Every structure is written in structure tokens, then in C-alpha cells.
Design a binder for this molecule. Structure first.
Ligand SMILES: CCCCCC/C=C/CCCCCCCC(=O)OC[C@H](COP(=O)([O-])OCC[N+](C)(C)C)OC(=O)CCCCCCCCCCCCCCCCC
Ligand SMILES: CCCCCC/C=C/CCCCCCCC(=O)OC[C@H](COP(=O)([O-])OCC[N+](C)(C)C)OC(=O)CCCCCCCCCCCCCCCCC
Lengths: 278, 279
């Protein structure tokens, strides 16, 4: 039921995003010991890039329709939740470390432990969601007689959807926990405001990321809920929102590093040129 | 409909909160030239207290049930009052934080009043669009559904009467979304002014406590209103308690330090007056 053209366009965009993420991974693994890369916590960037990979994979999984379907939907939604937690944890840890060293001074292990607890919260919520009530797909046909007190109307609808019995409670939980995390992250971004350079100070990236996150989540929640008879629109909007948010966050993280690195080695090459000239 | 004991208890608690807001308003207006009050923003504190009054008033309206047999406009007005009251409570705090940040980062109440006026105009245009496009309708629907799984088939008979909008989750996501973006910017502002001055002038702790309590209460009350419509006492008590807790906590965090630092100032004044009388 999905157009091949839209599928091809979305897959090409997601593959280009994955290639960009892999390029950033190669850059931050190869140039680990460089000053510009080393001062930007290259170990905590691996977790962000891994979460970005998970988010892109879930965006891919959002595009297959027919074939169970419950396992597919749970898999892609849990992949999205895990990937976004892994993307946003390291940034918050970096901001917290910058705040702590600035304010009357943290190893990578403690930050990774905090990120692991953050991930465990999501794992607990997803596990209790999957076990308490799965996302079983039901074919619903019914006849409804509407009485508003002034007019009588009758309608017969045969609808099919994949959802939980109490899906809004799990929604409100996941949205709520992520929102508390984002509020604390915005507080951290404010605290480490104009405290250092962009590659070290992850403050604009946090604000852009949380704003895009809230906007995309609201839009896609509404669109999935109500425009379910527009499969191409829902698929395109979901994939575009995931792609835009992930690509924007990763670009904000890594482009400053790339340009500062280019300037650093250009200066080193000029120094070597001067040494060779004499 | 609703138990008289729960109604009485909720009304007592809301009345006590409203009297506390009235006392804070009297303190702000009376001592508007005092140094501790003046270095705060009494004109903006008045707006915060008026928003608190609106939020306390809406909690009373949440307890009216099976009286206006008129029920649609009651829900519309109680929810619009909550939205406007939250805007009026939180806008002034953000304006005070922004003014503090801009004063100490250099290279005014009318401007902040204009900013919060725009903030309230956003909610006004959202609420007007909600009412005019998709208003609440109190409709009774009886229906039978033949729920069939991959291998199992069952039938159910449901007859329900609820007052809600046709595209209710659209307006929910919109208002929740705009409020959440403003609260994210408020958290950013609280971070920017994290340790810039004292709690009477600095509003970081009040902002963070308020946004956390607000998100938690809204998330709880959305779910319980949606899924526990068969528990009128529970939903009424929980909604009133959440509104009361949020408003009371925010206003106490704003105004108690003012009272503390005003009483200390007055005590110092009295001590020096007594020493002057001695000599
Ligand atoms: C950094 C990159 C990451 C950001 C990407 C943002 C994109 C989000 C799109 C996915 C969310 C919409 C889909 C909702 C679920 C669905 O498809 O329906 C199946 C169902 C709900 O179906 P339904 O209710 O939408 O439709 C049925 C309507 N009916 C009338 C029957 C009720 O899912 C559930 O039951 C709930 C599952 C919760 C699991 C978590 C979801 C993924 C979380 C990813 C975002 C978390 C981070 C951001 C949080 C926001 C900021 C605080
Ligand atoms: C500082 C003090 C203020 C904080 C007080 C926080 C308490 C909030 C409790 C009220 C919200 C729950 C009620 C939801 C609407 C309802 O009653 O159902 C009628 C209906 C929804 O009904 P329903 O969907 O819940 O039940 C019917 C289910 N059915 C299957 C039929 C759909 O309301 C609407 O249609 C939406 C109207 C939106 C108007 C705005 C609501 C009030 C706004 C107050 C909170 C804003 C500030 C916080 C935002 C979040 C933080 C970023």
C-alpha cells in the first residue's frame, strides 16, 4: 500500500544519514588522541552514534507493512526509545561534567553509569509494557447509534489497528520520563551557558535537540493517531522527523569538531612549511 | 453524584489556598515600596497571583457534576481557565528570570508585560480555535463490537455517555506542546541564572520545581481522566489535589523567601531603632 517512489526516497535519505553517522564514527575512532577530538569526550560520542544508528534502523523498520506484526511494532518502537535515550544520555553527561569542573571540581565510568541507569529506566518501562499488555492487532467491526440529545445518527465502521488496551498510559509514561530528562537537560544547557567553545560546550545542541524532539513527537503522535488512513503520509512524516532530528543533533555535535580539527592541522601544516623553508 | 465529604474537604483546601493567595496579594500591594519587595517584581507578582486565583477557581468548577444538565460550556470554561491561569502563573517568572539574566549580561516591566501578553495571546488563539472549530459535545453512544483476533472472536455491548471533542488529542498535543516548549525555555533560563543572586531575586529553584511538578501532574491527570471515568470521586479529588499542590508550591516558593527577608529586615530596623533610643 506504500508507493515504491516514497520508499526509495526515504531509504536513500536514511542510508545517507547512516553513512554520515559511520563517517563521524570513523573520524572519532581514528582521531581519538587529537587534542580537539580528545577534549570533546570521544568515548561518550560512540554511544551517541550508536543510538543514532538504532534510530535510523527503527526509521527503516517503520516502512514495512504486511509482515508477526505485533513483534515488528514493539521492536521498532523499543528500538526508537532505546536509540533516543542513547543519543541524549551522553550529551547530558558531557554538560554535567563541564558544569562540575567549572564549579569547584569525573571519570567516563561514572557518566556511563548514569547513562546506564537512564537506559535501565527505559528498559524497565518497555519490559513492563510488553509483558503487562502487548500490542495485539484486532479487527473491530461495530454498529454505533449516536444520541446527542437533539439528533440521532447511526454509523457502521469496520476498522483494524495495532495497539494496546491501555496505550495512552504507556504513552504518558514514556513521554513523561523523557520530558523530565529533557527538562533537566535544558537546565544543564543553561548552567553551562557560554562557558566554553561549541565543541566542548554542548548547550545549543541540547536546546535544538529537545525542541525538535518535542515538536516531532507531538506531530507524529497526532498524525499516527488520526491520519491512519494515509499510510504514505504517516510513513514519510515519521521517517522525515526521525531523520531530521537525528541528523541535526549529530551535525551540531560533530561539525564544530571537524572544522576545528581542519584549522588545527592547517596551522600545523603552516608551521611545518615554515620549518622546511628555513 | 459526588460524595459530600470529598466535596467539603476539597472546597476547604481550595479555600485555604485562595486565602493564602489573597494574603500574598495584600502583602505585595501593601509593601510595594519596601526594599525587599521592590528588588523583586511586585507588578509581575500580581500577575502570578491572579493566575493562581484563576487556577484555584477552575478546581472548584471541576467538582460541579450532574447539575447543569450547559455541561459543554462548563467543561470548556473550566479548561480555558486552567490554560490561562497556567500562562499567567508561569509567564511572569520567566520574565523575571530573563530580566535578571539580561541585567548581569550586558554589552522594564512594560516589555515583560508585553512578552507575557504575547504568551497569553498564543493560548487565546489556541483556545478560540479549539472552541470554534471542534467544540466539546456531550454525546451518548450505544454500540456493539465484534472483536475478532487472529483466532478468537468475542462480542461486547457498550453504552457510554462522555463529553469530549471529536479531535481532542489534536488540541491536547497542541496545548501540551506549546506549554512544554515554553517550559523548556524556562528551564534554560533557570539554568542561565543558576547562581546569579538570592532566591528572592533568583527564580531557578521555583522554575525547576514548578516545571517538574507541572509535567508530572498533567501526565497523571490526563491518564486518570481518560481511563478512570468510572471513578468520579477519584478523578475529581486527584485533579483538585494536583491543581492545589502545583499552585500552592509555586506561590510558596515565590513568596515565602520575600516574607523571611522582609521580617529579617524589619527586625534589624527595630534593633537599630532601639540602639538609637539607648544613645
Ligand atoms: C533523536 C531521534 C528520536 C526522535 C524521534 C521522534 C519520533 C517519534 C515517532 C514515534 C512516536 C509516535 C508513534 C506512537 C506509537 C504508535 O505508533 O502506535 C502504536 C501504539 C499506540 O497506538 P495509537 O494510540 O497511536 O493509535 C491507536 C488509536 N486508538 C484509538 C486505538 C487508541 O503504541 C503504544 O501502545 C504505546 C507505545 C509506547 C512506546 C514508546 C514509543 C516510541 C518513543 C520514541 C520517542 C521517545 C523520545 C521523545 C519523547 C518526547 C519528548 C519528551
Ligand atoms: C500551575 C497550576 C496549573 C497546573 C495544573 C495541572 C493540571 C492539569 C489537569 C487538567 C488536564 C487534564 C484534563 C484533560 C481534558 C479533559 O478533562 O477531558 C475533556 C477533553 C478530552 O477528554 P478525554 O480524551 O480525556 O476523555 C474522553 C476519551 N475519548 C476516548 C472519548 C477521547 O478535553 C479536550 O478535548 C482537550 C481540551 C484541551 C484544553 C486544555 C486543557 C487544560 C490545560 C491545563 C494544563 C496546561 C498546563 C500544563 C501543560 C503540560 C506541561 C507542558
Amino acid at each position: 500500500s506504500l508507493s515504491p517512489v516514497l520508499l526509495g526516497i526515504v531509504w536513500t535519505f536514511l542510508s545517507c544519514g547512516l553513512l554520515l553517522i559511520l563517517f563521524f564514527l570513523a573520524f572519532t575512532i581514528h582521531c581519538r588522541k587529537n587534542r580537539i577530538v580528545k577534549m570533546s569526550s570521544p568515548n561518550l560520542n560512540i554511544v551517541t552514534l550508536l543510538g543514532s544508528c538504532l534510530t535510523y534502523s527503527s526509521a527503516y523498520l517503520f516502512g514495512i507493512q504486511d509482515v508477526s506484526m505485533e513483534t515488528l511494532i514493539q521492536t521498532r518502537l523499543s528500538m526508537l526509545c532505546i536509540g533516543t535515550s542513547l543519543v541524549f544520555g551522553p550529551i547530558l553527561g558531557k554538560s554535567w561534567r563541564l558544569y562540575k569542573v567549572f564549579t569547584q571540581r569525573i571519570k567516563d565510568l561514572q557518566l556511563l553509569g548514569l547513562v546506564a541507569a537512564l537506559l535501565m529506566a527505559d528498559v524497565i518501562l518497555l519490559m513492563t509494557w510488553v509483558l503487562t499488555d502487548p500490542i495485539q492487532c484486532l479487527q473491530i467491526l461495530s454498529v454505533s447509534m449516536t444520541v446527542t440529545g437533539k439528533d440521532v445518527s447511526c454509523t457502521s465502521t469496520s476498522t483494524h489497528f495495532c495497539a494496546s488496551r491501555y496505550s495512552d498510559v504507556w504513552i504518558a509514561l514514556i513521554w513523561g520520563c523523557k520530558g523530565l530528562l529533557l527538562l533537566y537537560g535544558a537546565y544543564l544547557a543553561g548552567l553551562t551557558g557560554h562557558v566554553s567553545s561549541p565543541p566542548v560546550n554542548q548547550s545549543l545542541t541540547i536546546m535544538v535537540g529537545v525542541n525538535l524532539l518535542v515538536l516531532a513527537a507531538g506531530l507524529l503522535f497526532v498524525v499516527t493517531r488520526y491520519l491512519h488512513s494515509w499510510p504514505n503520509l504517516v510513513f514519510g512524516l515519521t521517517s522525515g522527523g526521525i531523520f531530521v532530528c537525528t541528523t541535526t543533533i549529530n551535525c551540531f555535535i560533530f561539525i564544530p569538531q571537524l572544522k576545528q580539527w581542519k584549522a588545527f592541522e592547517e596551522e600545523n601544516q603552516t608551521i611545518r612549511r615554515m620549518a622546511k623553508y628555513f
